[PDB]
Amino acid sequence: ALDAAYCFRNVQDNCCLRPLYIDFRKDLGWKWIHEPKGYNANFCAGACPYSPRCRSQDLEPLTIVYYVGRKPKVEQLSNMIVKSCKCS
Amino acid sequence: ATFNMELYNTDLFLVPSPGVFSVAENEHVYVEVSVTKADQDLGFAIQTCFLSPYSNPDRMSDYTIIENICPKDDSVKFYSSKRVHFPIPHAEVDKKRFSFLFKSVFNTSLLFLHCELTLCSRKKGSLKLPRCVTPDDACTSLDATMIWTMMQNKKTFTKPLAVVLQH
C-alpha cells in the first residue's frame, strides 16, 4: 500500500516508504521530550508517474513523556510516524 | 525586537551585576529577561531555565529550575514588573523577573545559566503565536501540542556564573 510490508521487501526507486530512526535531541533539537530517546519516524520518497510528489498518507501518533514543572505528563503526540505513502 | 538577560544584586532589580556574577551555596540569583520590541501585541514566556557546566545550551543538564513555564525548583519566586504605581527602570522594555536559591550540585568554579524564551501573543488573533500563559496557568494545565507550538519561536540566552565555596 506503499507501506512497510510492500516497500521494505521491494526496495526500488519509485515512491515508497523509507525506514528512518530519529533521535529527538540529536536529530530534531527537541530537548523537552524526556522519553523516548528516539523513534522510527520513517519518510516517503521516490519517483511518481504523471506534477505529483511522493508524500505521506497514513500517519500514527507517538506516546511521549515530558514535564511541566515537576509534573510528569504522558501524552500521545499525533502525526509522528509515517506508515504509508502515496503519489499526489 | 531585541532581547537580553541580566543578573542583579538583589530582589530590588536596581543594580545589574558587574562582571561575572559570583554566587555561593544558599545565596540567591536574581534574573531579569527583557525584550525591546515595536509590536505591543508581542510577548514572551520564560519556557525553560537550567544551570550547566557546559557553555553549549544543547548539552543536557539535571539542574533544571523552570521546565515549560512552571517552575521545577521549589525555591523559584516570580516578581511583577507590570505593577501600577511601582515603576521600574527603562519603560521601553518589557521584563520578566524571577529568583532561585543556588544549590551545590556541581563541583566547578564556573557554571552557565541557560534560559530559553518562547514568543506569544498578548492580544487575540493579532499574531501567529500562541497566547501568553502565566506560570500559574501552566502548572494547572499545559499540554504537549501547546508546548510543541511554543517551541517553534524560541530564543536562548546564556550567562556565566562564578561559583565560590564558603564555610
Author numbering:
A (entry chain B): 1 to 50, 75 to 112
B (entry chain A): 15 to 181
Sentences reproduced from the published study:
In spite of being a monomer and lacking the heel helix, mmTGF-β2 is much more soluble than TGF-β dimers and retains binding to BGZP-C25. This approach yielded high-quality orthorhombic crystals, enabling determination of the structure of the mmTGF-β2:BGZP-C complex at 1.9 Å resolution using X-ray crystallography. The BGZP-C binding site on TGF-β lies on the inner surface of the fingers of TGF-β2, involving residues L28, I33, V61, L86, I88, I92, K97, E99, and L101. The tips of the fingers of the ligand are also engaged and form contacts with residues located on the CC’- (P71, D72) and C’D-loop (N82, K86, D88), as well as the C’ strand (E81), with N82 being vital as assessed by Surface Plasmon Resonance (SPR). In contrast, in the structure of the mmTGF-β2:BGZP-C complex, the FG loop undergoes a disorder-to-order transition and forms a helix that also packs against the inner surface of fingers I-II and III-IV of mmTGF-β2. Hydrophobic residues A158, I161, W162, and M165 form crucial interactions with the concave surface of the growth factor fingers, including W30, W32, V92 and L101 and mutations within this region severely disrupted binding. The structure of the mmTGF-β2:BGZP-C complex shows that BGZP-C not only binds and engages the two critical basic residues on the tips of fingertips where TGFBR2 binds, but also occupies the underside of the fingers where TGFBR1 binds. For the BGZP-C domain, the key residues suggested by the mmTGF-β:BGZP-C structure, such as N82 and I161, were shown to be essential for binding, though most of the hydrophilic interactions occur between the side chain of one of the partners and the backbone of the other.
